[PDB]
Protein backbone atom coordinates (compact mmCIF):
# COMPACT_ATOMS: atom_id res chain seq x y z
CA UNK A 1 0.00 0.00 0.00
CA UNK A 2 2.82 2.40 -0.91
CA UNK A 3 3.27 2.46 -4.69
CA UNK A 4 0.72 3.85 -7.15
CA UNK A 5 0.17 3.26 -10.85
CA UNK A 6 2.35 0.16 -11.15
CA UNK A 7 1.54 -1.63 -14.40
CA UNK A 8 2.33 -5.23 -15.31
CA UNK A 9 1.01 -7.46 -18.07
CA UNK A 10 1.28 -11.22 -18.44
CA UNK A 11 1.79 -12.46 -22.00
CA UNK A 12 1.48 -15.96 -23.39
CA UNK A 13 -0.35 -18.23 -25.77
CA UNK A 14 -3.95 -19.34 -25.36
CA UNK A 15 -4.74 -21.92 -22.67
CA UNK A 16 -1.78 -20.97 -20.48
CA UNK A 17 -3.47 -19.62 -17.35
CA UNK A 18 -3.33 -15.82 -17.65
CA UNK A 19 -6.93 -15.30 -16.54
CA UNK A 20 -6.40 -18.05 -13.98
CA UNK A 21 -3.36 -16.18 -12.66
CA UNK A 22 -5.33 -12.94 -12.37
CA UNK A 23 -8.18 -14.70 -10.55
CA UNK A 24 -5.69 -16.37 -8.21
CA UNK A 25 -4.13 -12.98 -7.44
CA UNK A 26 -7.57 -11.54 -6.70
CA UNK A 27 -8.52 -14.48 -4.47
CA UNK A 28 -5.22 -14.36 -2.58
CA UNK A 29 -5.55 -10.61 -1.98
CA UNK A 30 -8.79 -11.15 -0.07
CA UNK A 31 -12.34 -9.78 -0.08
CA UNK A 32 -11.20 -6.67 1.81
CA UNK A 33 -9.23 -5.29 -1.14
CA UNK A 34 -11.40 -4.17 -4.09
CA UNK A 35 -10.71 -5.89 -7.41
CA UNK A 36 -12.26 -4.68 -10.66
CA UNK A 37 -12.24 -7.12 -13.61
CA UNK A 38 -12.84 -5.86 -17.11
CA UNK A 39 -12.49 -6.69 -20.79
CA UNK A 40 -11.19 -4.38 -23.49
CA UNK A 41 -14.59 -4.13 -25.19
CA UNK A 42 -16.42 -2.61 -22.20
CA UNK A 43 -14.72 0.77 -22.66
CA UNK A 44 -16.78 1.49 -25.81
CA UNK A 45 -19.87 2.87 -24.11
CA UNK A 46 -22.75 4.80 -25.71
CA UNK A 47 -23.57 7.82 -23.52
CA UNK A 48 -20.04 8.71 -22.34
CA UNK A 49 -16.60 8.80 -23.92
CA UNK A 50 -14.17 5.91 -23.57
CA UNK A 51 -11.69 7.87 -21.44
CA UNK A 52 -14.43 8.80 -18.97
CA UNK A 53 -15.39 5.13 -18.60
CA UNK A 54 -11.74 4.18 -18.05
CA UNK A 55 -11.42 6.86 -15.36
CA UNK A 56 -14.66 5.63 -13.76
CA UNK A 57 -13.16 2.14 -13.53
CA UNK A 58 -9.94 3.63 -12.16
CA UNK A 59 -11.88 5.35 -9.38
CA UNK A 60 -13.87 2.16 -8.77
CA UNK A 61 -10.64 0.18 -8.36
CA UNK A 62 -9.56 1.59 -4.96
CA UNK A 63 -11.51 1.54 -1.71
CA UNK A 64 -11.98 3.40 1.56
CA UNK A 65 -13.04 1.91 4.91
CA UNK A 66 -14.82 4.39 7.19
Amino acid sequence: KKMSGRAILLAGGPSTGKTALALAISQELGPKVPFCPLVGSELYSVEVKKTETLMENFRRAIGLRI
Binding site: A22, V48, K50, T51, L54, R59, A61, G63, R65, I66
Partner: protein
Amino acid sequence: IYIEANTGAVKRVGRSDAYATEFDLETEEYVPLPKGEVHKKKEIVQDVTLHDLDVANARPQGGQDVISMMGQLLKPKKTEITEKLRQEVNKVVAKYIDQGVAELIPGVLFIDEVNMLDIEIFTYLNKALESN
Protein backbone atom coordinates in the same frame (compact mmCIF):
# COMPACT_ATOMS: atom_id res chain seq x y z
CA ILE B 1 -42.58 2.90 13.08
CA TYR B 2 -38.81 3.15 12.59
CA ILE B 3 -37.12 6.47 11.77
CA GLU B 4 -33.42 6.94 11.01
CA ALA B 5 -31.92 10.30 11.96
CA ASN B 6 -28.85 10.30 9.70
CA THR B 7 -30.70 9.88 6.39
CA GLY B 8 -34.29 10.76 7.24
CA ALA B 9 -35.49 7.36 6.01
CA VAL B 10 -38.93 6.44 7.36
CA LYS B 11 -40.42 2.95 7.45
CA ARG B 12 -43.70 2.00 9.12
CA VAL B 13 -43.06 -1.35 10.79
CA GLY B 14 -46.76 -2.03 11.22
CA ARG B 15 -49.74 -1.93 13.54
CA SER B 16 -48.98 -2.41 17.23
CA ASP B 17 -49.97 -5.69 18.85
CA ALA B 18 -52.10 -3.90 21.46
CA TYR B 19 -54.98 -3.34 19.01
CA ALA B 20 -55.00 -6.97 17.88
CA THR B 21 -58.81 -7.23 18.24
CA GLU B 22 -60.48 -4.69 15.95
CA PHE B 23 -61.63 -6.72 12.92
CA ASP B 24 -62.08 -10.47 12.64
CA LEU B 25 -60.57 -10.45 9.13
CA GLU B 26 -58.33 -7.39 9.50
CA THR B 27 -55.71 -7.49 6.74
CA GLU B 28 -53.13 -5.39 8.60
CA GLU B 29 -50.33 -7.32 10.29
CA TYR B 30 -49.39 -6.71 13.91
CA VAL B 31 -45.98 -6.31 15.55
CA PRO B 32 -44.98 -6.13 19.24
CA LEU B 33 -43.63 -2.89 20.62
CA PRO B 34 -39.85 -2.53 20.16
CA LYS B 35 -37.62 -3.17 23.15
CA GLY B 36 -35.26 -0.66 24.72
CA GLU B 37 -35.37 3.11 24.80
CA VAL B 38 -36.76 5.05 21.86
CA HIS B 39 -33.36 6.55 20.93
CA LYS B 40 -30.43 4.27 20.09
CA LYS B 41 -26.95 4.84 18.67
CA LYS B 42 -24.83 2.36 16.71
CA GLU B 43 -21.31 2.32 15.28
CA ILE B 44 -20.68 0.71 11.88
CA VAL B 45 -17.56 0.15 9.78
CA GLN B 46 -19.21 0.16 6.35
CA ASP B 47 -16.78 0.18 3.42
CA VAL B 48 -17.06 2.32 0.28
CA THR B 49 -15.21 3.05 -2.96
CA LEU B 50 -14.05 6.42 -4.24
CA HIS B 51 -16.30 6.14 -7.29
CA ASP B 52 -19.26 5.44 -4.98
CA LEU B 53 -18.93 8.68 -3.02
CA ASP B 54 -17.99 10.48 -6.24
CA VAL B 55 -21.23 9.48 -7.96
CA ALA B 56 -23.00 10.17 -4.65
CA ASN B 57 -22.72 13.92 -5.24
CA ALA B 58 -22.38 13.56 -9.01
CA ARG B 59 -25.97 12.28 -9.23
CA PRO B 60 -28.31 11.44 -6.33
CA GLN B 61 -30.46 8.43 -5.44
CA GLY B 62 -32.35 10.23 -2.70
CA GLY B 63 -35.31 8.18 -1.56
CA GLN B 64 -38.84 8.69 -0.25
CA ASP B 65 -39.26 12.42 -0.95
CA VAL B 66 -41.31 13.27 -4.03
CA ILE B 67 -39.11 16.27 -4.86
CA SER B 68 -35.98 14.09 -4.70
CA MET B 69 -37.74 11.44 -6.79
CA MET B 70 -38.59 13.90 -9.55
CA GLY B 71 -35.12 15.45 -9.38
CA GLN B 72 -33.47 12.06 -9.86
CA LEU B 73 -35.98 11.29 -12.62
CA LEU B 74 -35.20 14.54 -14.47
CA LYS B 75 -31.83 13.24 -15.68
CA PRO B 76 -31.78 9.49 -16.52
CA LYS B 77 -28.40 9.29 -18.31
CA LYS B 78 -24.89 9.23 -16.89
CA THR B 79 -22.41 11.95 -17.83
CA GLU B 80 -18.71 12.75 -17.69
CA ILE B 81 -17.49 13.96 -14.29
CA THR B 82 -15.44 17.15 -14.08
CA GLU B 83 -12.01 16.96 -12.48
CA LYS B 84 -13.10 19.56 -9.91
CA LEU B 85 -15.52 17.07 -8.35
CA ARG B 86 -12.71 14.51 -8.18
CA GLN B 87 -10.42 17.04 -6.49
CA GLU B 88 -13.09 17.95 -3.93
CA VAL B 89 -13.69 14.24 -3.27
CA ASN B 90 -9.94 13.78 -2.77
CA LYS B 91 -9.81 16.70 -0.33
CA VAL B 92 -12.77 15.38 1.68
CA VAL B 93 -11.30 11.86 1.81
CA ALA B 94 -7.90 13.24 2.86
CA LYS B 95 -9.54 15.20 5.67
CA TYR B 96 -11.43 12.09 6.78
CA ILE B 97 -8.34 9.88 6.87
CA ASP B 98 -6.34 12.62 8.61
CA GLN B 99 -9.02 12.87 11.31
CA GLY B 100 -8.36 9.22 12.19
CA VAL B 101 -11.82 8.08 11.10
CA ALA B 102 -11.06 6.16 7.89
CA GLU B 103 -8.32 4.25 6.08
CA LEU B 104 -7.52 3.82 2.39
CA ILE B 105 -7.10 0.43 0.70
CA PRO B 106 -5.87 0.55 -2.91
CA GLY B 107 -7.19 -2.12 -5.23
CA VAL B 108 -6.39 -3.85 -8.52
CA LEU B 109 -7.78 -3.25 -12.01
CA PHE B 110 -7.64 -6.29 -14.30
CA ILE B 111 -8.08 -5.88 -18.06
CA ASP B 112 -8.30 -9.07 -20.11
CA GLU B 113 -7.71 -8.94 -23.88
CA VAL B 114 -6.09 -5.51 -24.01
CA ASN B 115 -5.58 -5.97 -27.76
CA MET B 116 -9.16 -4.76 -28.28
CA LEU B 117 -8.17 -1.28 -27.09
CA ASP B 118 -7.43 1.38 -29.70
CA ILE B 119 -4.64 3.95 -29.89
CA GLU B 120 -6.58 6.77 -28.20
CA ILE B 121 -7.43 4.67 -25.13
CA PHE B 122 -3.82 3.47 -24.98
CA THR B 123 -2.56 7.07 -25.02
CA TYR B 124 -5.04 8.17 -22.35
CA LEU B 125 -4.10 5.21 -20.14
CA ASN B 126 -0.45 6.13 -20.66
CA LYS B 127 -1.24 9.63 -19.40
CA ALA B 128 -3.41 8.45 -16.49
CA LEU B 129 -0.88 5.92 -15.19
CA GLU B 130 1.44 8.77 -14.21
CA SER B 131 -0.99 9.98 -11.53
CA ASN B 132 -0.84 10.09 -7.74
